[PDB]
Amino acid sequence: CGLQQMQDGELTQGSLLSFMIYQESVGSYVQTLVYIYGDMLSNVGAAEK
């Protein structure tokens, strides 16, 4: 999608690279947040007795 936008002229190469870096970083951070929160919940709830 970013390559299509850049070809259309909406954003330049540097903007595309910066956005890809930032968006991949936030994707990784959000996946880590979700996984770690679920892991903590599972570990706490497995000790229900």
């Binding site: 903007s15 930032y22 903590m40 007795k49």
Partner: protein
């Protein structure tokens, strides 16, 4: 009962040092990264969700 008292208690607190650190780092960073990628391109930012 002894198995509970010696293993489920370990499970209940087995992740704080790593999971807490990772969660807090990601929480600190995500807001700023989203702000940056909004500054570059809100269109691609909405796409990234």
């Amino acid at each position: 009962l002894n198995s509970r008292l010696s293993s489920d208690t370990t499970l209940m607190s087995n992740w704080l040092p790593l999971n807490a650190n990772v969660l807090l780092r990601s929480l600190v960073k995500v807001v700023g990264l989203y702000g940056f990628m909004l500054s570059i391109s809100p269109r691609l930012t909405l796409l990234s969700l």
